[PDB]
Each structure stands twice: as C-alpha cells, then as structure tokens.
Design an enzyme around this catalytic site. Structure first.
Site, mmCIF file in Angstrom:
data_model
loop_
_atom_site.group_PDB
_atom_site.id
_atom_site.type_symbol
_atom_site.label_atom_id
_atom_site.label_comp_id
_atom_site.label_asym_id
_atom_site.label_seq_id
_atom_site.Cartn_x
_atom_site.Cartn_y
_atom_site.Cartn_z
ATOM 1 N N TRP A 187 -7.948 6.272 -2.556
ATOM 2 C CA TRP A 187 -8.229 6.929 -3.821
ATOM 3 C C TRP A 187 -7.248 6.374 -4.836
ATOM 4 O O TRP A 187 -6.232 5.792 -4.467
ATOM 5 C CB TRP A 187 -8.145 8.461 -3.722
ATOM 6 C CG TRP A 187 -6.926 9.007 -3.053
ATOM 7 C CD1 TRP A 187 -5.680 9.138 -3.594
ATOM 8 C CD2 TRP A 187 -6.849 9.550 -1.730
ATOM 9 N NE1 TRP A 187 -4.834 9.736 -2.692
ATOM 10 C CE2 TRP A 187 -5.527 10.001 -1.540
ATOM 11 C CE3 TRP A 187 -7.774 9.706 -0.688
ATOM 12 C CZ2 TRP A 187 -5.101 10.597 -0.349
ATOM 13 C CZ3 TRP A 187 -7.353 10.296 0.495
ATOM 14 C CH2 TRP A 187 -6.026 10.738 0.653
ATOM 15 N N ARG B 89 -0.218 3.880 2.772
ATOM 16 C CA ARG B 89 0.088 3.626 4.182
ATOM 17 C C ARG B 89 0.992 4.676 4.831
ATOM 18 O O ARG B 89 1.206 4.653 6.044
ATOM 19 C CB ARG B 89 0.728 2.248 4.336
ATOM 20 C CG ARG B 89 2.208 2.222 4.010
ATOM 21 C CD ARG B 89 2.659 0.822 3.701
ATOM 22 N NE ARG B 89 4.108 0.691 3.744
ATOM 23 C CZ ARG B 89 4.743 -0.372 4.227
ATOM 24 N NH1 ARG B 89 4.054 -1.403 4.704
ATOM 25 N NH2 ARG B 89 6.067 -0.387 4.277
ATOM 26 N N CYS C 45 0.795 -1.222 0.000
ATOM 27 C CA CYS C 45 0.000 0.000 0.000
ATOM 28 C C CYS C 45 0.831 1.278 0.000
ATOM 29 O O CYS C 45 1.551 1.572 0.953
ATOM 30 C CB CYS C 45 -0.986 0.024 1.163
ATOM 31 S SG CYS C 45 -2.214 1.338 1.001
ATOM 32 N N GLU D 36 -3.134 2.921 -12.546
ATOM 33 C CA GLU D 36 -3.703 1.582 -12.658
ATOM 34 C C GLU D 36 -5.112 1.345 -13.147
ATOM 35 O O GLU D 36 -5.393 0.240 -13.547
ATOM 36 C CB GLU D 36 -3.608 0.878 -11.317
ATOM 37 C CG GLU D 36 -4.729 1.266 -10.377
ATOM 38 C CD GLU D 36 -4.607 2.677 -9.825
ATOM 39 O OE1 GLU D 36 -4.678 3.681 -10.565
ATOM 40 O OE2 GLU D 36 -4.470 2.779 -8.606
#
Ligand code: HEM
Length: 322
Positions: free
Chosen positions: A243, A83, A80, A248
């Site tokens: 978000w 994070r 992530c 991607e």
C-alpha cells in the site's frame, strides 16, 4: 563487492553444476526455519530435489517453499519500508499458467483481492519459473495499475512522465490512446515467451482516490516487472503489491507550483486516502500491520530488476510497429 540489482535474460537452462548449489542452500535455509526439527525431512527433500535436477534439468518448489521464498525475498528487500511485516503476504500460485489470457485472469484476481474495496492487502502472484529463457512469462508494465504518459508539442507532459516509452509501446501495439491525465494503461502480458498481448483492465477493478484542484490516483501500488530469484530458480513474472506511503504518489503530472523554497508537501494525499478509507502507511497502519506480523510468530531469495522486455524481445510477427 556491490552486486548487480538486475537479473537479465537467458537462452539456455541453468546448468546443473550451477543450479544444485543454490537449490541445496535454499532447502537448507528453508529447513533452517525449523532449527532441530525436520532433519530426516530435510535430507529427504535434498535427495528428491537433486534427483529432480539430474533427471529433468530443474526442480519445482513446494507451495510452502514458494510461500517462504516470497516472504524471505520481501524481507531481503533493502529499500522496502514494508519489509518490517514480511509475514503479512498472500501468495497466489499461478505456476501452471499457460496463456496471456490466463495471466490476465490471475492478475484480475490479484487486483481484486489486493484492493479489497480499499482495505489493501499485500499479495504476490507467482507465474511459471524460467525454463530455457525463451519461454519467459513477463508483465511489460512497471506497475499493474499506472497512468499513461503522453508527449506534448512543446516537450511537456500529460499524464505520468515515467510511462512515456511504455505508453508509446502500447499505442504501437494497437492500444487506442485517449489523451487524458488519468488514463489507466492496459496490461501488456507475455506468456510462454510469445509476443505480448494487450488487455484493458476492467475499470471496475481500479480503485481511485480523489485528491477544480484536479487530481486522482489509484489506490493500489503493485510492482509488476521484477524477478523472484530463489534457490537458483527464476520467476520473471511475479507481480506484488503493498500500500502507499503517501510520501510518494508520483503526481509528476505537473506545473503544480500552484519557509525556504522546496516546500511541496504531501498532506492532501494522507487526508484524501484516509477519508475514502484506502489503506496508506500512516502511523496507525504501520503500528497495526506490525502487530499483525508479530502475531504470526549474495542475498537469496531476492527480487531483482530486469531489462525492459521491449528492448530484448525477439518478435514473432504479431502487432505491427512493435
Ligand atoms: C505493505 C506495504 C508496503 C509498503 C508500504 C512498501 C513500501 C516500499 C517502499 C517505500 C519502497 C521504496 C520505493 C519504491 O521502490 O517504490 C518499496 C520498495 C520495494 N518493495 Fe515494498 N512495500 C510494501 C510491500 C511490499 C511487498 C508486499 C513486497 C513484495 C512481496 C515488496 C517488495 C519491495 C521491493 C522488492 C521493492 C524494491 C526496492 C528494494 O526493495 O530495495 N514491498 N516498498
């Protein structure tokens, strides 16, 4: 030593000699966030939690312990990129949810809050924790909002290729399939371990960004199929969101071939999202979200992957051709 990133089903409550050690470590980690503060509070909590595990076979986290766990698990998420700002997380306590109808309302609130008319806000809705493993709460979707994937005669794709099986499952559960490229899949919700129920997501709740060129894409990327592990407790139902990166947006709805060679960029997306005022992780957002994070000032807790529910579900009777 590499550990499994998947946490499967159970058919009996977690044994006490296995739960206690984990609960104690979480509580330590929890109170550890206050180095020399709350020593008597820490011991009082340990005694209560242990008494709870011994008398009821399990224990309930406090709202604060839950909030802390959801943020730590986010922080502990290896891949992530978000994070970095793990403190920017709104938690919704749905631990007393009982029905799929109630799950639906909680998800609606989550989608509403999170979307925030484009000004995306990270949130997680935590449903009841796994008891005996036979009364699991699960969202059969991979994401709260995702496009249906339809098989074609020649072996091609219409919609999202990654949702082929799930889409078929929906059709098999009664859902009426329109055959477009941007059909928002319904929610397949399992409550208390019962058969899943299908719920159409109010079109109003789906914010989409317009990319003929011919493309659209939802503003909210919300993972719906992971399990939150915290202090031995397991939450099979805990949809969360952040978000997009822009890097991607899986428009693998393609024949989009429409330097070296592999030069298919992601520009129109960055621009499209920005002009429609939908949060995307650009440089300003990365910087801004990090600023907000700073102003607030075995890996466990952790978000695990699960075995797709339709591959493990012991049907009752409802919805034929399951
Ligand atoms: C704030 C915006 C966020 C961004 C830009 C972001 C970005 C990412 C990216 C790029 C990935 C890797 C690709 C993928 O698995 O889809 C990812 C994975 C993931 N994110 Fe996020 N994320 C955000 C928020 C969150 C939130 C709020 C949670 C949970 C509370 C979270 C939990 C995870 C988890 C568990 C994964 C799975 C892969 C892994 O952690 O190793 N993310 N995120």
């Amino acid at each position: 030593n590499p550990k499994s990133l998947t946490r499967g089903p159970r058919d009996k409550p977690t044994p006490l000699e296995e739960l206690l050690p984990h609960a104690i470590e979480f509580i330590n980690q929890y109170y550890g966030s206050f180095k020399e503060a709350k020593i008597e509070e820490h011991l009082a909590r340990l005694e209560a939690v242990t008494k709870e595990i011994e008398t009821t076979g399990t224990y309930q986290l406090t709202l604060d312990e839950l909030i802390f766990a959801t943020k730590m698990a986010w922080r502990n998420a290896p891949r992530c990129i978000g994070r970095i700002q793990w403190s920017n997380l709104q938690v919704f306590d749905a631990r007393n949810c009982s029905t799929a109808q109630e799950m639906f309302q909680h998800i609606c609130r989550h989608i509403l809050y999170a979307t925030n008319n484009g000004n995306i806000r990270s949130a997680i809705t935590v449903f009841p924790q796994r008891s005996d493993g036979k009364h699991d709460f699960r969202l059969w979707n991979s994401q709260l909002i995702r496009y249906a994937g339809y098989q074609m005669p020649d072996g091609t794709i219409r919609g999202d290729a990654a949702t082929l099986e799930f889409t078929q499952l929906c059709i098999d559960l009664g859902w009426k399939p329109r055959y477009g490229r941007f059909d928002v899949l319904p929610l397949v919700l399992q409550a208390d371990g019962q058969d899943p129920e299908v719920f159409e997501i109010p079109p109003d709740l789906v914010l989409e960004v317009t990319m003929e060129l011919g493309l659209k894409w939802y503003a909210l990327p919300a993972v719906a199929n992971m399990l939150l592990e915290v202090g031995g407790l397991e939450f099979p139902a805990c949809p969360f969101n952040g978000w997009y990166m822009g890097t991607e947006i899986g428009v693998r709805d393609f024949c989009d071939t429409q330097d070296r060679a592999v030069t298919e960029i992601n520009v129109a997306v960055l621009h499209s999202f920005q002009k429609q005022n939908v949060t995307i992780m650009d440089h300003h957002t990365a910087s801004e979200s990090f600023m907000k994070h700073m102003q607030n000032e075995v890996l466990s807790p952790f978000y695990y992957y699960q075995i797709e529910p339709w591959k493990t579900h012991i049907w009752q009777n409802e919805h034929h051709h399951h």
